[PDB]
Structure 1
Amino acid sequence: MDFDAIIIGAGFGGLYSLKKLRDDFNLKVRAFDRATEVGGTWFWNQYPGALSDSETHLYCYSWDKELLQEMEIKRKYISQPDVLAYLKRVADKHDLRKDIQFETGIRSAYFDEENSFWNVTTENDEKFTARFLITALGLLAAPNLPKIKGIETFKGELHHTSRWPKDVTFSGKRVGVIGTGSTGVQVITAIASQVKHLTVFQRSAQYSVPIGNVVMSETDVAKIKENYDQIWENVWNSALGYGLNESTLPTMSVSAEERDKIFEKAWQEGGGLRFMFETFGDIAVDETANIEAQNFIKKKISEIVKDPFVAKKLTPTDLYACRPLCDSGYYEIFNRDNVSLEDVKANPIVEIKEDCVVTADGVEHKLDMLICATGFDAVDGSYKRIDIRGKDGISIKDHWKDGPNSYLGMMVSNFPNMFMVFGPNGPLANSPPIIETQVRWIADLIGYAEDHQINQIEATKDAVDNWTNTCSDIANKTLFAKVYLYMGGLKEYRNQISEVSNNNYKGCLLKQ
């Protein structure tokens, strides 16, 4: 049938895209998701230790103040089952499920350049027509299974963290974990005390700081809910949106005693972004500052891990670091008698047999269970996995063959009436604040189309290449170089797009 808008995704971005377009702008709209329930990545990713790296009171929606006062704030950080339960309550309250079609994947989306709408086809050969396409696909594509010889011969339990089954038990089992990223650190910390023996196959050690996830008292929660209006105003007025006191103090402008005290204070409070952006202001910019942040965490590793040779294996060797990981006792794990750490860069994995992982030294690591916390493909992977064709039938895979590009992280030279929520080339901040910022900006432009009887918004290649130059300008100011992301912060990003919404959407081709 016909719709004013069609949304792909029932996660954070899709649920708010549905609420804003349907109830506030009174548009006819339908959303689609492969899953059986809302939640997005929080429905799929149920691996042990899954936890937000934003604090509980900020990893949520800000637009429903009755929901904020209603909100469950159990611990300082929120687990996957509680994020899922929160998103379900959002769907229960605002009557969202009746306009979501579940168990329905989108195969193709073709823009009708004549009638100026999109032709969307599901994986079941069902076709829907709609003026606008809202893509809220998130950061997911399950496969980065390790390309290891004989991985298909393993007869024990083999799980990727994105497809974690239920009823997994660990007692009496020899378990292996490949990968020490954010997910691997969470899995290893959660299961180490439950397994008979754990082998960690680390190819690249990373910096991790304690998260300090503690229960929240009723007065801790009251201290938040009573000041929630000011808390969100600080989010909109910040670069990261994590509720941090973002520092402008340069690292080398204080004594070594003063520097050590500031790093220790953030370490005790917890949080990876706090240690990097609440301590000082040039850790991601100046090289000498970045090395000081490294040395503090290296000193912490050498203090926690009592075996100096294990601590050495856990210490990163790269000269310059980016954002640390957050953990609830990761480095303490490696003091346990039932934990073995394997440097698979000096001793790579060469084969997987029916009952073991064998490294280059010939040692067979016998395992009952092998966990692959090996990550996924890139941002665009969610977009290139759908057959999206825009003007002159050009596909989203072809136009993004040389990496992704967009205008304000929301529109592409492929997009005539297709708006990206949390898409590539967006800001680097707390996701729910970013998602609210884009959904409100996208609905404003769509409302700016219904009143003026316009039916085709497009973005120039000049505007897309101008957004690429903006991001490339800020990105090369930082150590994070050596254009996927805008690194100017959430506040400046809201100003970049406000100058567009004010100047009658400069860079956008409107056709009546």
Structure 2
Amino acid sequence: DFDAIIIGAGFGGLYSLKKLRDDFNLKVRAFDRATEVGGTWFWNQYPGALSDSETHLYCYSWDKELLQEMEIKRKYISQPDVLAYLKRVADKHDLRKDIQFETGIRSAYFDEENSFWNVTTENDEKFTARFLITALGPLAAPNLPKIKGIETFKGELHHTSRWPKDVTFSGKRVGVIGTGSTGVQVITAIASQVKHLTVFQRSAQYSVPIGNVVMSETDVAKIKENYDQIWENVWNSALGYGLNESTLPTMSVSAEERDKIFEKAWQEGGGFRFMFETFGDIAVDETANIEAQNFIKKKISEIVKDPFVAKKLTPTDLYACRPLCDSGYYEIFNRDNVSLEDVKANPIVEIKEDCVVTADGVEHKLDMLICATGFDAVDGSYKRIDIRGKDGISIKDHWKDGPNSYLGMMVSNFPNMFMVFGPNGPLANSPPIIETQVRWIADLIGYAEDHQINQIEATKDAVDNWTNTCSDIANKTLFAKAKCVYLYMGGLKEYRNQISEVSNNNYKGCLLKQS
């Protein structure tokens, strides 16, 4: 028996374990298929893996001693340094004794009599616990392409989610499929190392510089001397990225100054900065979003010297959501050993034993094929586990027509269930979101321990209201008429208030059963 069983040992699962065990004296056990904490930062070790958020903000805020002790080597933190930080979090607080590694979760069945969950691992072992917190993160199963001939490639085949150890690049003809944030980071990292690189681009996207400069002793001292300060701005901001969230409209100024505002954010770096520190209407106004696109379009023309390759790298969408961040991505295509292949116009139809064959018939002889093709949505991480709640209804049937939840943390028909970084959550930096949700969930379990209650459940009507206020805000933006499987877009501050409006009104919209 346990009070809580944690599924996941990443950012969410680690702080969920710390809170329930140490701050509430509960008997908790965490599980993970991995052999070490980290989550996506343990699984994804591809070349160039780097955070969207800056180093001083992509961490935990609750441990003040850790913040003053934290290493800040560069403006953004690389994957090995994130794993080391999360390893130190597990070390300093002795969490590892309460996680069982190499242990997946097959089924999670809610018992309607004693009001607890039946969690069966993949080792034919099951445990019982009143509460089941689920910290599976946003990334799910790796969406690999459906290409004829995938099995016949005799060379190295790697998807970025399962990047193996000891991969050498020199002297090899390497091909990369996918031009997302993962594909961009791999391409800039390896193009200088390979004999020839081939980029199979299905859809071009906008990418801004990241500016990952080294941090000086004075820079790190300026941050740590003012750390209580930086975090208060995070809870008061909408994105939690430490940005000067602008309200100035794009078209309410001269073209000479509009170019100055874009160029300043272009020089400082960051995808969210170029979109939300510049002006405050890029994500709502059609004219504003066009202006931001043309600045990146103009930038693409200046860097890519070949106009035909520059035309290939230019996105064709009428509306653009959040761009990517890069450390010299458009600069890569100026090299003698880099070839861009518009795969939307020249699709891959077959890959033979030693090459990739596009529709035009050209065989692209590769020694190694990297798959940076992304993953599935957040619901896939849940649909992959046999979660049966009330009536024995499985998580696949209740979410068969898209995911939904109440405050992004609880589902109807699934009582005693609390989701960390679940669907219908806020669009912001993940560590502030995870800290916000683990605090809200834990204090509700504390209210549960004190008032002698054994079953909490959200109503079907509350999750309908929550999905209505999510579409309420979303339809104010062009994120519907663009690339966009649902999100709350009111900001971190409004999200912190909304769940406080619930936890103050005696948890309105939640069923509370006594025994």
The normalised TM-score by structure 2 is: 0.99
Q: Would you say the 8 A contact 2:141–2:380 is kept in 1?
A: no
Q: Would you say the 8 A contact 1:139–1:378 is kept in 2?
A: yes
Q: Secondary structure at the match of 2:284?
A: coil
Q: Secondary structure at the match of 2:151?
A: helix
Report Cα offsets for 1:465-493 as digits up to 9, x if no partner.
Answer: 00000000000000001291000000000
Q: Secondary structure at the match of 1:331?
A: coil
Tell me, in whole angstroms, the C-alpha distance in 2 between the residues paired with 1:482 and 1:150: 35
Report Cα offsets for 1:327-358 as digits up to 9, x if no partner.
Answer: 00000000000000000011000001000000
Give the root-mean-square deviation of aligned CA atoms: 0.8
Tell me, in whole angstroms, the C-alpha distance in 2 between the residues paired with 1:10 and 1:141: 15
Q: Would you say the 8 A contact 1:138–1:422 is kept in 2?
A: yes
Q: Would you say the 8 A contact 2:148–2:349 is kept in 1?
A: yes
1:139: Cα distance to partner? 2.0
Q: Would you say the 8 A contact 1:144–1:375 is kept in 2?
A: yes
1:44: Cα distance to partner? 0.2
> How do residues 76-225 of structure 1 correspond to structure 2 at under 5 angstroms?
76-225=75-224
Tell me, in whole angstroms, the C-alpha distance in 2 between the residues paired with 1:143 and 1:436: 27
Report Cα offsets for 1:214-256 as digits up to 9, x if no partner.
Answer: 0000000000000000100000000000000000000000100
Report Cα offsets for 1:114-139 as digits up to 9, x if no partner.
Answer: 10000100001111000100000012
1:111: Cα distance to partner? 0.4
1:140: Cα distance to partner? 2.6
Tell me, in whole angstroms, the C-alpha distance in 2 between the residues paired with 1:433 and 1:207: 26
Q: Would you say the 8 A contact 1:104–1:122 is kept in 2?
A: yes
State, as a whole percentage, how many aligned pairs show the same letter: 99
1:193: Cα distance to partner? 0.2
Q: Would you say the 8 A contact 2:319–2:481 is kept in 1?
A: no
Q: Secondary structure at the match of 2:164?
A: coil
Tell me, in whole angstroms, the C-alpha distance in 1 between the residues paired with 2:147 and 2:324: 26
Q: Does 1:460 align with 2:459?
A: yes
Q: Would you say the 8 A contact 2:110–2:117 is kept in 1?
A: yes
Report Cα offsets for 1:133-180 as digits up to 9, x if no partner.
Answer: 000001233331110001110000000000000100000000000000
Q: Secondary structure at the match of 1:169?
A: coil
Report Cα offsets for 1:235-290 as digits up to 9, x if no partner.
Answer: 00000000000000000001000100000000000000000000000000000000
1:212: Cα distance to partner? 0.2
Tell me, in whole angstroms, the C-alpha distance in 1 between the residues paired with 2:398 and 2:76: 39
1:211: Cα distance to partner? 0.2
Tell me, in whole angstroms, the C-alpha distance in 2 between the residues paired with 1:482 and 1:261: 28
Q: Would you say the 8 A contact 1:236–1:491 is kept in 2?
A: yes
1:379: Cα distance to partner? 1.1
Report Cα offsets for 1:352-376 as digits up to 9, x if no partner.
Answer: 1000000000000000000000001
Tell me, in whole angstroms, the C-alpha distance in 1 between the residues paired with 2:511 and 2:143: 38
| Structure 1: runs of 5 or more not aligned | none
- Name the counterpart of 1:299: 298
1:415: Cα distance to partner? 2.4
Q: Would you say the 8 A contact 2:169–2:194 is kept in 1?
A: yes
Tell me, in whole angstroms, the C-alpha distance in 2 between the residues paired with 1:86 and 1:326: 23
Q: Does 1:495 align with 2:497?
A: yes
Tell me, in whole angstroms, the C-alpha distance in 1 between the residues paired with 2:262 and 2:140: 36
Tell me, in whole angstroms, the C-alpha distance in 1 between the residues paired with 2:451 and 2:239: 35
Stretches of 4+ aligned residues off by more than 3 angstroms: none
Tell me, in whole angstroms, the C-alpha distance in 1 between the residues paired with 2:490 and 2:413: 25
Q: Secondary structure at the match of 2:409?
A: coil
Report Cα offsets for 1:37-75 as digits up to 9, x if no partner.
Answer: 000000000000000010000000000000000000000
Report Cα offsets for 1:183-204 as digits up to 9, x if no partner.
Answer: 0000000000000000000000
Tell me, in whole angstroms, the C-alpha distance in 2 between the residues paired with 1:138 and 1:105: 15
Q: Would you say the 8 A contact 1:427–1:486 is kept in 2?
A: yes
Q: Would you say the 8 A contact 1:211–1:270 is kept in 2?
A: yes
Q: Would you say the 8 A contact 1:142–1:163 is kept in 2?
A: no
Tell me, in whole angstroms, the C-alpha distance in 2 between the residues paired with 1:409 and 1:473: 15
Tell me, in whole angstroms, the C-alpha distance in 2 between the residues paired with 1:60 and 1:151: 39
> How do residues 210-359 of structure 1 correspond to structure 2 at under 5 angstroms?
210-359=209-358
Q: Secondary structure at the match of 1:57?
A: helix
Report Cα offsets for 1:412-460 as digits up to 9, x if no partner.
Answer: 0132101000001100000000000000000010000000000000010
Q: Would you say the 8 A contact 2:4–2:131 is kept in 1?
A: yes
Tell me, in whole angstroms, the C-alpha distance in 2 between the residues paired with 1:268 and 1:130: 51
Tell me, in whole angstroms, the C-alpha distance in 1 between the residues paired with 2:500 and 2:3: 24
Q: Secondary structure at the match of 2:166?
A: coil
Tell me, in whole angstroms, the C-alpha distance in 1 between the residues paired with 2:115 and 2:34: 30
Q: Secondary structure at the match of 2:251?
A: helix
Tell me, in whole angstroms, the C-alpha distance in 1 between the residues paired with 2:154 and 2:196: 18
Q: Would you say the 8 A contact 1:460–1:509 is kept in 2?
A: yes
Q: Does 1:20 align with 2:22?
A: no
Q: Secondary structure at the match of 1:88?
A: helix
- Name the counterpart of 1:481: 480
Q: Would you say the 8 A contact 1:395–1:414 is kept in 2?
A: no
1:378: Cα distance to partner? 1.1
Q: Would you say the 8 A contact 1:396–1:414 is kept in 2?
A: no
Q: Would you say the 8 A contact 1:174–1:196 is kept in 2?
A: yes
1:84: Cα distance to partner? 0.2
**Corresponding residue pairs, total:** 511
Q: Would you say the 8 A contact 2:13–2:135 is kept in 1?
A: yes
Q: Secondary structure at the match of 1:188?
A: helix
Q: Secondary structure at the match of 1:402?
A: coil
Q: Would you say the 8 A contact 2:458–2:511 is kept in 1?
A: yes
Tell me, in whole angstroms, the C-alpha distance in 1 between the residues paired with 2:48 and 2:244: 27
The normalised TM-score by structure 1 is: 0.99
| Structure 2: runs of 5 or more not aligned | none
Tell me, in whole angstroms, the C-alpha distance in 2 between the residues paired with 1:140 and 1:258: 39
Q: Would you say the 8 A contact 1:137–1:382 is kept in 2?
A: yes
Q: Would you say the 8 A contact 1:33–1:102 is kept in 2?
A: yes
Q: Secondary structure at the match of 1:30?
A: strand
Q: Secondary structure at the match of 2:77?
A: strand
Tell me, in whole angstroms, the C-alpha distance in 1 between the residues paired with 2:71 and 2:88: 11
Q: Would you say the 8 A contact 2:176–2:183 is kept in 1?
A: yes
